[PDB]
Amino acid sequence: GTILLDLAPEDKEYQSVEEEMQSTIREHRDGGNAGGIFNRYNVIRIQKVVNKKLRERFCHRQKEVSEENHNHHNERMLFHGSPFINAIIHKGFDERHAYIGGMFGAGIYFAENSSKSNQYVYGIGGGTGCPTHKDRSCYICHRQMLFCRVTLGKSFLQFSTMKMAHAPPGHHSVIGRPSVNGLAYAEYVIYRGEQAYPEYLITYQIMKP
Numbered sequence: 640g641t642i643l644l645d646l647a648p649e650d651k652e653y654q655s656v657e658e659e660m661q662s663t664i665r666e667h668r669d670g671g672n673a674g675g676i677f678n679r680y681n682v683i684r685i686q687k688v689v690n691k692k693l694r695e696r697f698c699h700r701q702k703e704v705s706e707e708n709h710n711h712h713n714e715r716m717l718f719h720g721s722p723f724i725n726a727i728i729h730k731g732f733d734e735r736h737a738y739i740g741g742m743f744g745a746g747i748y749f750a751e752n753s754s755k756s757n758q759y760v761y762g763i764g765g766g767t768g769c770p771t772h773k774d775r776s777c778y779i780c781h782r783q784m785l786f787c788r789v790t791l792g793k794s795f796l797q798f799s800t801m802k803m804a805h806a807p808p809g810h811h812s813v814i815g816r817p818s819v820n821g822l823a824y825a826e827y828v829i830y831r832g833e834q835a836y837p838e839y840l841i842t843y844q845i846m847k848p
């Protein structure tokens with residue numbers, strides 16, 4: 640199954656992932672209630688997720704989407720936060736765990752901003768926070784998030800709630816675009832687990848300002 644390769648802090652690949660993560664911290668409307676109060680992370684390690692079977696499923700789907708999208712799979716690197724990160728790195732993303740109540744329905748959701756994904760690391764609205772101290776703004780406990788290859792293909796642009804079970808006809812993803820009366824930041828949604836690969840596993844802490 641899955642093998643985790645350690646990236647060295649001196650390598651360009653580690654430094655690239657960390658800078659995407661650190662540079663995309665945004666101020667959130669909840670004033671940090673969900674993800675905590677911070678302006679920076681302390682990155683503990685960065686591992687590359689290797690899984691032959693998961694990679695094969697992802698690459699086959701990229702070929703199918705490409706055939707339906709003028710020979711482009713339209714891949715983006717995006718963040719994902721979830722309390723089920725262990726299941727994802729071993730079994731892959733799974734749309735069967737997605738439920739229809741989400742803003743864009745039963746999809747798998749990603750963000751270009753790491754601080755958005757940091758809000759979901761411990762669950763719904765940050766849940767009860769870290770397992771040891773029950774603190775959503777814990778500065779001690781190691782959190783984990785993924786920085787994923789996401790196959791978007793033909794994206795359907797959406798501004799308001801649209802509870803879908805699958806991608807809209809003739810499309811492969813939904814992009815929830817920001818709007819004055821809606822989202823502050825874009826969110827990217829897929830409806831098939833094989834349209835995302837959990838490429839990097841980031842272990843980190845949020846830092847006290």
Ligand SMILES: C[C@]1(c2nc3cccc(C(N)=O)c3[nH]2)CCCN1
Pocket residue numbers: 718719720721741742746748749750755756757759826827
């Ligand atoms: C609220 C919801 C969610 N919306 C997101 C928007 C951007 C990123 C993420 C993430 N997990 O990194 C999101 N997760 C709907 C599905 C379960 N959690």
Ligand SMILES: [Zn+2]
Pocket residue numbers: 769770771772773774777778779780
């Ligand atoms: Zn803690």
